[PDB]
Amino acid sequence: AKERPIWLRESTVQG
Amino acid sequence: GPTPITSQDIINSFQSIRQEMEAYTPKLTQVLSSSAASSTITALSPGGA
Amino acid sequence: LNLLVIVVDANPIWWGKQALKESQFTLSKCIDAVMVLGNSHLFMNRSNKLAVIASHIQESRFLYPGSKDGKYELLTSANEVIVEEIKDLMTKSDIKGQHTETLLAGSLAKALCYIHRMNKEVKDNQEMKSRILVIKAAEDSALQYMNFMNVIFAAQKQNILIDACVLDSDSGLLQQACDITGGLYLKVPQMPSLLQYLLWVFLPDQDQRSQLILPPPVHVDYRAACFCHRNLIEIGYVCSVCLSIFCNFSPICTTCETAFKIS
Amino acid sequence: NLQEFLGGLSPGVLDRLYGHPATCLAVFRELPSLAKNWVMRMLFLEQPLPQAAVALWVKKEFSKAQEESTGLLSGLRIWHTQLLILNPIFRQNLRIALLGGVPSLDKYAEERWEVVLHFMVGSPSAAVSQDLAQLLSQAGLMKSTEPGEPPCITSAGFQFLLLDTPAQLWYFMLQYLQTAQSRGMDLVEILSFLFQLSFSDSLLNFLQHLREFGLVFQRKRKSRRYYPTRLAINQPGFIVVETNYRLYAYTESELQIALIALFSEMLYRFPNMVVAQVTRESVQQAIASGITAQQIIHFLRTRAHPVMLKQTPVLPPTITDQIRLWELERDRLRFTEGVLYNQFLSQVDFELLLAHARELGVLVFENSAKRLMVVTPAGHSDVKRFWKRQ
Ligand SMILES: [Zn+2]
Ligand SMILES: [Zn+2]
Q: In angstroms, rounded to a whole number, what is the distance separating the alpha carbons of residues D84 and D306?
A: 52
What does C12-69 look like in DSSP terms, one character per residue?
HHHHHHHHHHT-S--HHHHHHHHHHHHHHHHHH-SS-B--EEE--SS---EEE---TT
Q: Is the peptide bond prior to C215 cis by the omega test (within 30 degrees of 0)?
A: no
The CA–CA distances, whole Å, from C97 to B6, B10, B19, C58, D175 equal 10, 8, 21, 11, 71
Q: In angstroms, rounded to a whole number, what is the distance separating the alpha carbons of residues C105 and C141?
A: 10
Length of chain B: 49
**Residue C245 to residue B26, Cβ atoms within 8 A:** no
Amino acid at D300: L
Q: Which residues of B touch C86 (CB under 8 A)?
A: 21
Amino acid at D138: Q
- Spatial CB neighbours of D180, under 8 Å, sequence gap ≥ 6: D186, D187, D190, D206
Q: In angstroms, rounded to a whole number, what is the distance separating the alpha carbons of residues D273 and D258?
A: 13
Q: Is B in contact with A (3 or more beta carbon pairs below 8 Å)?
A: no
The CA–CA distances, whole Å, from C36 to C41, C82, D31, D40, D88 equal 8, 12, 20, 11, 19
- Spatial CB neighbours of D220, under 8 Å, sequence gap ≥ 6: none
Q: In angstroms, rounded to a whole number, what is the distance separating the alpha carbons of residues C173 and B2?
A: 11
Shortest CB distance from D59 goes to which of C203, C204, C212? C212
**Residue A11 to residue D328, Cβ atoms within 8 A:** no
- Spatial CB neighbours of D13, under 8 Å, sequence gap ≥ 6: D187, D188
Ligand 1 geometric centre to CA of C252 (Å) = 14
Find, among D286, D330, D255, D304, the residue nearest to D158 by Cα: D286
Neighbouring C-alpha atoms within 13 Å toward the C-beta of D9 = 25
Beta-bridge mates of residue D365 = D374
Interface subset of C 232-251, CB within 8 angstroms of B: 232-233, 245
| Burial class, C106, CB count within 10 angstroms (exposed 0-12 / middle 13-18 / buried 19+) | middle
Q: Give the residue from C80, C200, C201, C206 with the most D CB atoms within 10 Å of its CB, the best one to mutate.
A: C200
Q: How far is C71 from chain D (nearest CA, A)?
A: 6
What does A1-15 look like in DSSP terms, one character per residue?
--PPPHHHHS--S--
Q: In angstroms, rounded to a whole number, what is the distance separating the alpha carbons of residues D39 and D78?
A: 9
Question: Sign of torsion, CA B28 B31 B35 B39?
Answer: negative
**Contact yes or no for D240/D227 (Cβ under 8 A):** no
Flag whether residue C46 sits within 8 Å of chain D, measured between CB atoms. Answer: yes
Find, among C151, C113, C148, the residue nearest to C130 by Cα: C113
- Spatial CB neighbours of C98, under 8 Å, sequence gap ≥ 6: none
Q: Closest residue of D to B45, CA-based?
A: D53
Phi-psi region of C26 (alpha: psi -120 to 50; beta: other; left: phi over 0): beta
Q: Closest residue of D to C79, CA-based?
A: D99
For chain C, after which residues does the C atom lie more than 2.5 Å from the next written residue's N, i.e. where is it broken? 65
SS in 3 state form for chain D? Answer: CHHHHHHCCCHHHHHHHCCCCCHHHHHHHHCCCCHHHHHHHCCCCCCCCCHHHHHCCCCCCCHHHHHHHHHHHHHHCCECCCCCCECHHHHHHHHHHCCCCCHHHHHHHHHHHHHHHHHHCCCCCCCCCHHHHHHHHHHHHEECCCCCCCCEECHHHHHHHHCCHHHHHHHHHHHHHHHHHHHCCCHHHHHHHHHHHCCCHHHHHHHHHHHHHCCEECCCCCCCCCEECHHHHCCCCCEEECCCCEEEECCCCHHHHHHHHCCCEEEEEECCEEEEECCHHHHHHHHHHCCCHHHHHHHHHHCECHHHHCCCCCCCHHHHHHHHHHHHHHCCCCCCCCEECCCCCCHHHHHHHHHHHHHHCCEEEEECCCCEEEECHHHHHHHHHHHHHC
Q: In angstroms, rounded to a whole number, what is the distance separating the alpha carbons of residues C162 and C242?
A: 29
Task: Count the Cβ atoms, other than its own, within 10 Å of residue D128.
Answer: 7
Question: Sign of torsion, CA C79 C81 C82 C84?
Answer: positive
Q: What are phi and psi of D305, to 5 degrees?
A: -65, 150
What does chain C look like in DSSP terms, one character per residue?
--BEEEEE---HHHHHHHHHHT-S--HHHHHHHHHHHHHHHHHH-SS-B--EEE--SS---EEE---TTS--HHHHHHHHHHHHHHHHHHHS----SS--SPP-HHHHHHHHHHHHHHHHHS-TTS----EE--B--SPPPGGGHHHHHHHHHHHHHHT-EE-B--BSS--HHHHHHHHHHT--B--BS-GGGHHHHHHHTTSS-HHHHTTS--PPPPP-----B-TTT--B-SS----SSS----SS--SS-TTT---PPP-
Q: How was this structure determined?
A: cryo-EM
Flag whether residue D317 sits within 8 Å of chain A, measured between CB atoms. Answer: yes
Beta-bridge mates of residue D247 = D241, D276
- Spatial CB neighbours of C261, under 8 Å, sequence gap ≥ 6: none
Q: Closest residue of D to A9, CA-based?
A: D317
- Spatial CB neighbours of C185, under 8 Å, sequence gap ≥ 6: C163, C164, C166, C175, C178, C179, C217, C218
Flag whether residue B47 sits within 8 Å of chain C, measured between CB atoms. Answer: no
Task: Count the Cβ atoms, other than its own, within 10 Å of residue D67.
Answer: 11
Q: How far is B22 from chain D (nearest CA, A)?
A: 19
Q: In angstroms, rounded to a whole number, what is the distance separating the alpha carbons of residues D273 and C117?
A: 44
Find, among C201, C166, C210, C64, the residue nearest to D40 by Cα: C201
**Contact yes or no for D255/D161 (Cβ under 8 A):** no
Shortest CB distance from D61 goes to which of C44, C46, C211? C211
**What are the CB-based long-range contacts (under 8 Å, 24+) for D366-370?**
none
What does C221-238 look like in DSSP terms, one character per residue?
----B-TTT--B-SS---
Q: In angstroms, rounded to a whole number, what is the distance separating the alpha carbons of residues C114 and D263?
A: 54
Flag whether residue B43 sits within 8 Å of chain D, measured between CB atoms. Answer: no
Q: In angstroms, rounded to a whole number, what is the distance separating the alpha carbons of residues C36 and D100?
A: 10
Q: What is the CA radius of gyration of chain D?
A: 27
Q: In angstroms, rounded to a whole number, what is the distance separating the alpha carbons of residues C25 and C167?
A: 12
b/e code D37-61 from CB counts within 10 Å (16+ = b)? bbbbbbbbbeeebeeeebeebbeee
End-to-end CA, chain B: 33
**Contact yes or no for D160/D171 (Cβ under 8 A):** yes
Phi-psi region of D44 (alpha: psi -120 to 50; beta: other; left: phi over 0): alpha
**Contact yes or no for D39/D94 (Cβ under 8 A):** yes
Q: In angstroms, rounded to a whole number, what is the distance separating the alpha carbons of residues D364 and D379?
A: 10
Ligand 2 geometric centre to CA of C235 (Å) = 16
**Contact yes or no for C37/C202 (Cβ under 8 A):** yes
Q: Which residues of C touch B1 (CB under 8 A)?
A: 145-146, 149
Q: Closest residue of C to B39, CA-based?
A: C193
**Residue D57 to residue C35, Cβ atoms within 8 A:** no
- Spatial CB neighbours of B36, under 8 Å, sequence gap ≥ 6: C190, C192, C193, C196
Q: What are phi and psi of D276, to 5 degrees?
A: -135, 155
Instruction: Indicate the angle between helix axes D23-30 and D88-97, nearest 10 degrees.
Output: 90
Shortest CB distance from B37 goes to which of D44, D53, D100? D44
Task: Count the Cβ atoms, other than its own, within 10 Å of residue D98.
Answer: 22
Phi-psi region of C171 (alpha: psi -120 to 50; beta: other; left: phi over 0): beta
Q: What is the CA radius of gyration of chain C?
A: 21
Find, among D318, D116, C172, the residue nearest to A12 by Cα: D318
**Contact yes or no for B7/C97 (Cβ under 8 A):** yes
- Spatial CB neighbours of C80, under 8 Å, sequence gap ≥ 6: none
**Contact yes or no for D217/D206 (Cβ under 8 A):** no
Task: Count the Cβ atoms, other than its own, within 10 Å of residue C216.
Answer: 7
Q: What is the CA radius of gyration of chain A?
A: 9
Counted across chains B and D, CB pairs separated by less than 8 A come out at 20
| Burial class, D149, CB count within 10 angstroms (exposed 0-12 / middle 13-18 / buried 19+) | exposed
Q: In angstroms, rounded to a whole number, what is the distance separating the alpha carbons of residues C140 and C174?
A: 8
The angle formed by the CA atoms of residues D256, D259 and D262, to the nearest 5 degrees, is 150
**Contact yes or no for C128/C148 (Cβ under 8 A):** no
- Spatial CB neighbours of B22, under 8 Å, sequence gap ≥ 6: none
Q: What are phi and psi of D9, to 5 degrees?
A: -140, 150
For chain B, after which residues does the C atom lie more than 2.5 Å from the next written residue's N, i.e. where is it broken? 5
End-to-end CA, chain D: 49
Amino acid at D350: F
Ligand 2 geometric centre to CA of C249 (Å) = 12
Length of chain A: 15
Nearest-ligand number for the alpha carbon of C254: 2
- Spatial CB neighbours of D88, under 8 Å, sequence gap ≥ 6: none
Q: Do the strands D273-277 and D246-249 form a parallel or antiparallel pair, or are they unpaired?
A: antiparallel
Find, among D357, D53, D294, D39, the residue nearest to D158 by Cα: D294
Beta-bridge mates of residue D340 = D374
Task: Count the Cβ atoms, other than its own, within 10 Å of residue D377.
Answer: 9
**Contact yes or no for C72/D97 (Cβ under 8 A):** yes
Q: In angstroms, rounded to a whole number, what is the distance separating the alpha carbons of residues D221 and D233?
A: 22
Give Cα B32 distance to the centre of its chain.
Answer: 12
What ranges do the domains of chain C cover?
1-204
Q: In angstroms, rounded to a whole number, what is the distance separating the alpha carbons of residues D60 and D187?
A: 41
Ligand 1 geometric centre to CA of C227 (Å) = 6
Q: In angstroms, rounded to a whole number, what is the distance separating the alpha carbons of residues D78 and D84?
A: 9
Find, among C35, C25, B40, the residue nearest to D41 by Cα: B40
Q: In this complex, which chains have at least 3 CB pairs below 8 Å with chain A?
A: D
**Contact yes or no for D376/D364 (Cβ under 8 A):** yes
Amino acid at A5: P
Q: In angstroms, rounded to a whole number, what is the distance separating the alpha carbons of residues D343 and D326?
A: 40
| Burial class, D201, CB count within 10 angstroms (exposed 0-12 / middle 13-18 / buried 19+) | exposed
Flag whether residue D325 sits within 8 Å of chain A, measured between CB atoms. Answer: yes
b/e code D231-269 from CB counts within 10 Å (16+ = b)? bbeeeebbbbbeeebebbbebeeebbebbbebbbbbeee
Task: Count the Cβ atoms, other than its own, within 10 Å of residue C164.
Answer: 23
Q: In angstroms, rounded to a whole number, what is the distance separating the alpha carbons of residues D154 and D169?
A: 18
What does B1-49 look like in DSSP terms, one character per residue?
------HHHHHHHHHHHHTGGGS---TTTTS--HHHHHHHHHHHSTT--
Find, among C58, C53, C59, the residue nearest to C5 by Cα: C53
Find, among D154, D175, D165, the residue nearest to D111 by Cα: D165
Length of chain D: 390
